[PDB]
Every structure is written in C-alpha cells, then in structure tokens.
Amino acid sequence: LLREIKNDRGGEDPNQKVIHGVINSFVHVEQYKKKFPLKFYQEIFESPFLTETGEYYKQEASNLLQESNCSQYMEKVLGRLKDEEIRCRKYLHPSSYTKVIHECQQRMVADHLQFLHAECHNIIRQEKKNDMANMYVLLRAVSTGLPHMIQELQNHIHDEGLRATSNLTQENMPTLFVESVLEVHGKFVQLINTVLNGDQHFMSALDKALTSVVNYREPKSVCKAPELLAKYCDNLLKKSAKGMTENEVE
Amino acid sequence: EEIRCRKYLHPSSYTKVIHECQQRMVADHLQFLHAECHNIIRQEKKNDMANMYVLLRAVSTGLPHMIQELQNHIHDEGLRATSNLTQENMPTLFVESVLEVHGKFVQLINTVLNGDQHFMSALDKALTSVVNYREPKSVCKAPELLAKYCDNLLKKSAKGMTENEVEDRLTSFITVFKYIDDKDVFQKFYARMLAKRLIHGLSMSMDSEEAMINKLKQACGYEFTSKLHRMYTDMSVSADLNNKFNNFIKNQDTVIDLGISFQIYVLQAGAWPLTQAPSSTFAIPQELEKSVQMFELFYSQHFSGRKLTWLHYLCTGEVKMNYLGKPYVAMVTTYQMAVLLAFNNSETVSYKELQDSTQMNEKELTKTIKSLLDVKMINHDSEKEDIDAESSFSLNMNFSSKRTKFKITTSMQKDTPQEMEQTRSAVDEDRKMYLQAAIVRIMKARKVLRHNALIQEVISQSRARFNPSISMIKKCIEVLIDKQYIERSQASADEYSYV
Amino acid sequence: RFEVKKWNAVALWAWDIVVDNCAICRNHIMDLCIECQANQASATSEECTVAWGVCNHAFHFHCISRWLKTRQVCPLDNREWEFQKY
Ligand SMILES: [Zn+2]
Ligand SMILES: [Zn+2]
Ligand SMILES: [Zn+2]
16 A cells, blocks of 8 residues: 555556545444544554655655755755645545654654754845745744744844944934834845744844844943934934925824 | 904804805805816816815815816826827936926916815826826836936936036926836836946946935835945945055065956945846956956955855956057957957957857857947958858958047947846836735734735735736735645635634 | 956955854864964964854954954944954
C-alpha cells in the first residue's frame, strides 16, 4: 500500500478509488466496536505509514539541499507540503490528516533549522519579500522556528531605522527625524502585513526595535528625541504661511 | 424686508421673518429658479449667478443642485480646453490648459460666488475627472504628461528661461498635480526622468531639482518623495566622494596611473529607479581594470559592507581617436568605448572578434555598431550593411567633421514604449503590493467584512495613491488564498475570515 | 592609437552584511583581523577581541580603533560608536 503511495509521491498516479476504499476499509471493519474505532487503523496502517514517510521525506529533504540553495529549497518544500494537503486528503481516513502533515514538517523544516536560521539572516537584510513568506510558513508550524526570525527582523529594523535617522541636517532636523521613523514604521508595517501575515509576534519585534532607535542616546549626552518631537509639534501648529492647511495639520 | 423689520419688530423676530420670507419667494419658486439654473451656469452670467447663489444659499435644498450644475459645466468647460491640444507641444499645453480653466474658475468662485467651500469643492470634484481624461479602452497619459512637462522645464534649454521663472511656474504646476489620481504613476515616471537629468548632468540647476523635490514633498507627504530625496542626496554628496577618493590616491604608498580623475556617481540601489535589466557580462578594459580595483579597494576603507554593483549601461566617457589629421574628442559610452579598443588592437575585426573582447549580449553588441554605423564613424566592409554573423569592418577614416566635440548619443532622453510598459506594469506591481497591505490590515481590524464594505474603503484609503481596479483587488485575495493568509467564508462569499 | 581619458561611471551601492562577519576586515569575526591576518606570528592571536556597542555590531578591536582614527562613526549605521562589552 505504501509502495503505491511512494510511487504516487514519485510522480505517477495509481488507482486512488481502489486505494481510498482499501484504506477506509481498515477503519470500516471496526464500525461495530464501542471504543477506539480507529485502533485497528492506527496499529496496522498509520504507524507503518508514518515510519515510511518519516524515512522518505528525510531522504527527500537531504536529496534537495545538494543541488539547491535556500532561495529555491523553500519553494520545493511548499510544493511537497501542498501535495501532502492533497495526497492524504484522498488516500487516508480524515482523522490522520494532521499527523501526516505534522510528520512531513518534522523531516523537511524541523530537522533543518540550522540551515534555515543560517539563511534566515540573509533574507531579511536583502528584503526578499517573495522568499520571506515561504520562510514564515515553514517556521510557523515548528515550535522553535519563529523565535529566531523575530530577532533577525528586529536587528534589521534597528539597523535600518538608525540609518534613516543619521546625519540629519540641522536646517529641518525635527521634520526629518519624525518622517524618517514614520516611513521605517510605514514600510515595515506594510511588509509585515503583506509578507509575514501581519503576525502579532512580529509587531512586538518592530515595536521594540523602534523603541531603541528613538531612544538612541548620543555618547556622553542625552536622547534628543523628546526635544525633537516637541519642536516638530511647534513647526506645524504655529501660524505659518508655508501652506499647512487645516486638513493637512490634523 | 430687513430694513422694514429693523424699524418695527423685536430683534429676536428678525431671523424668523426673513426665513419665512425666503420660505415663500425662493422656496416655493425653487423649481422656477432651478429651471434657468442650468442655463445661468452655461452662459456664465456672473452677476445673475451671484443673485441666484445668494437666494439658493438660504434654501436648505437649493444649493446642491446649483453645485452639480456648476460641476457639470466646469466638466463641460474643462473637456473642451483639453480635447484640441496639439500632439507636438502637448505637455506644455495640457498643464497650461488646466491652469487656464482652473485659474478663471478659482477667480470665478472666489469673486462672484463669495468663495464658498462647497463650490470650491465642486471645482475639485469636477476638474479631477477633467485632468484624468482617460479615453475609453486606453490609458490616461496625464502622469506621463506632467512628467514630461516637469522634465521639459527642468532641462537646460536653448530658450533658457530664468531661474525665478521656474519657481512661479512650478507653484502652479503643483495645483495641477493635486488632481492627478495617479500619483504613484507619476512617481515612477518622474524618477526615471530625474535619473536622465542626474547621471548625464542634463539639469537646469542643482537647487532647481531640490526646489522641485521639496515642493513635491509639500504636496504628497514624505513617503512619496523619500526615494527622490535620496537620489538628490547621493548626487549632491558625490562631488565630495570624488575628492575624497582623490585624497586616497595621494594617501597611497605608491602613485597609481589611470585615466582622468574619477567622477563616480555612487547611488543607493534601494531607492534609485535604476535596475540591472541587462545581464551582459561586460568586461572592463585592461587599461581601465586597475582603475576600478583602486576605487573598490578605497571604498572598503571609507565604507564597509557595501559590495558595489557596477552599472555599465549608463557609464560613459571619452576617447582620443588619434588616427586623423587633427585630434578629435568624442563623448562615448563604455559599451562603445571598449569595442573601440579592438580598433586600436587591430583595424581588421569581425563580429566574433568582439565576442571574446566584451562578453556582452548580442542585442547590446548590435546596438554598439548600430550606434556606430549610422554616425559613419566605422565602415561595414561587408557587402550587406545589415547585421550578420561575420560583420567584418574597420575604422572609417572619412569622418572629418568640423566639430571638435561630439557625443555618440544613443536613444537616451527618449521614451521607448517597452520599458514604459514595464514601468507601467511595475507601477501595477506596486499597486498590487499596497493593495494586499490594506486588505490584511482591514481584516486585522474586524476579521469579518462584506465584499462591498471591503471594496469601498480600500478605494477611500488608496484614493490618494490611485484608483484600484476591482479585478486587481480580487486578484489580491486569490494570492493571499494561495499564500494561506485570507479566507473567504463558506456560508457566503460576501464575508471573509482569517487563516 | 586610441587612448581613453574620461570614464563617467555610475555604480549602485547596497548592503552585503553576511552573518557573523567582520564588516571592516571582510572575514569572520572569530578569526583574526586583517591587520593581524598578515604577520600572524607577531600577534598572539588573542587581541582580536569581539567588540560591541550600542549599534549592536561586532568587529575586532583593531577595526574600530583603526576606524576611529579616520572618523568617530560606526560604518554600518551612520551614528557615533560606543563600547558596551568586552
Ligand atoms: Zn576586523
Ligand atoms: Zn588583530
Ligand atoms: Zn553600528
């Protein structure tokens, strides 16, 4: 039965109507049992299936890194993980939908966290929006995949907001300082909401990172932000003839 | 009636008498005034319209009909002044045609219409569709037209209008730009036109670009001009960079020989609209090879973690063509500069002799000779003058033009429709990028909305950017379905949920 | 004889910060600095201490000390450099 599943994973398509009826037969026999109707289904089919797909996707994941970098290895993983959303949906009883998916991740993303986190840093610093979404969904299911990309995004925003709020001209220092942080906040809120699903765990990283750039005290001095924002409120609420309509001010 | 009321009745009765007076002379005759209300605006009878406006101002339901009548007439007036624009001086005409319509109507509303805000808002609503005169089954050329108009005045010109003339002209240009409904389309187009005005130095003045950028920042916030301001910052500091590198040459232990002192124009790749569209592996000349490495070595000393991407398709220069009776000087691009080194190496040269010289693509290699055969600098020795695999040619000594300086200008400062369509597609790609941001953020607030409410507010939220197509929005849901982000409701496709 | 003099040139600059790499010395932070890369026998292979600062960037101690002679600004972010740890 796994040989027609392994061949199905190999590209060809066997008789799914024959396969689905056989697998559903393993649980339909126990329909008269009062307790554990899937006990025969699990101890005869599911445990050999999880073991077989455990040794195949571990084999397949190691077969992919040899000729593929992280920018395209993640693309193929969602390709396999999308087939698994289809393959088990028509080959297995629905009660085993999660465990096959969960074990599939345990051999492709959960056993390669060292490779993913090593290449996680280079995705953020080059702002690959298309390939960052693939990294997010892979590390969402793993219990320890997300809390490393949080640090990389925070240490990138903290390294980016400091760039935009540096060497400011003294001619219009308050307006330059406020609008620099706003666009760093404006860009990355757009980036988190689009690419990383607008995840709550990433907004806290952005909020914490923007706290550091605003309160970035000068050496042997005091933080200039609480005075600069006061001067920015003065620069627009004053009676000035440089445009600044009432709708614009609000 | 008030003068009658002042001398007789109590002051508390002043309003009620004249309100019921208007209730029986202009409220009962509201339709009678509405009869010629269309006529009184089309003929633009100034003093008669004001008397109509004064009476309709007191009516609770007499002004909005007059607001629509003026709006349609301004729409009628605006369309007439933009249809007959010539194809030659269109960018100059289109801005001035709108200003002529806008200027007289502001003069109309402020003077004889008492400067009413709703009438002013009627002009804003009416003229917005006028300037955005999108012909059916086509594209609106207004963002490109304003890009051309701003670029035409910002170039150094033979006519040479004064420095103070541009500032008053640009101030009125902002008023037209306030109604464009496609500000993102203008941003990409203006960024490209700012590029051709900056690398080649083809600008009226440095401070004119700063003034032009700052006026844009006063009109559309800071995020609209942040990329452009970063372009101006890099182009301004680049003067100090070349002097700073010239100190590095004097800071070296040994003297380094090279061409003229560098005029490098290091630009921030994040915000500049320049993109490595060609993938040709254009090798630098051996004479020029050590020149690049010295600047690369210097750049690691005064900067860090940078790793320059050496743009070549906008890199130019000069060459001494020492083969003629008197020395000639010609501005040459680096693609056509390197192929001239073949002429110095050997007068006889074929197409395949250049393959192992520049390692460039066949299209850019064809364009180099195509920019050389039309100027008759080279002479194609083959019987057929078109492109061919052999392409045997030599140096045409017949070129003895009286000019001592001449550029080899390719189609720069022209707008090829292929990349404009790519830029328009890039704008639409930017449109899709922002549209997905609003969709998830709207779902981030309530997590359940109908299709109509979701569609309508995104139009309102993105009104300052563009007018997003409903099919363009509907694609964004499908992408988030594919990226398992959004989820429409199974009970009704009208409602939406969260993944 | 063709001779080239002017080379009007444009090069885009970006960021190339690979992880745990000395940005100035262009190698790993755990290795020796580029000043200590040559004449390794002269150095004791310990003075390349991993510097730290409020900019949260790690280099060897020879990098910023040589960098501070030219300018007092961190290279990655254009702000003044500090020492926070050892
Ligand atoms: Zn170092
Ligand atoms: Zn050292
Ligand atoms: Zn730093």
